Amino acid sequence: NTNGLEFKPGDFTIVFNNQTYDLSKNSDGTNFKLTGKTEEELLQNLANH
C-alpha cells in the first residue's frame, strides 16, 4: 500500500448529464491514493472506483 496515484483535487473533473463531478474526490470528497500494483490491475481498481 506504499505507492499509488495521489488524486489531484479540482485539476480533474468530468461532465455528463451536464453534471460536473470531481473524481479525484471520492463521494466523501477524498483525493484517493489508489494502490495499484500494475497498470491494468490498477485499471480494474478504477472499475472498482
Binding site: 479540482g10 473533473t13 460536473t20 463531478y21 470531481d22 474526490k25
Partner: protein
C-alpha cells in the same frame, strides 16, 4: 404603479452553498424574493405560484 414594485422588492438575505463550474463547492449569501420563495413574476407583470 412603480411604488408598488419598489414595495415589492425589499427582502431579507440568506446563506447558501453552490456549484459553479468544476465541483467548485462554494458557500453563498443571497437575497430572497417571493420568487426565490417560489412565486415567479413574468415580464408580463403577473405571478406564478409553485
Amino acid at each position: 404603479r412603480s411604488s408598488i414594485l419598489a414595495d415589492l422588492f425589499d427582502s431579507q438575505v440568506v446563506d447558501g452553498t453552490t456549484e459553479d463550474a468544476n465541483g467548485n463547492k462554494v458557500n453563498t449569501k443571497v437575497m430572497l424574493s417571493m420568487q426565490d420563495f417560489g412565486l415567479s413574476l413574468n415580464d408580463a407583470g403577473t405571478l406564478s405560484f409553485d
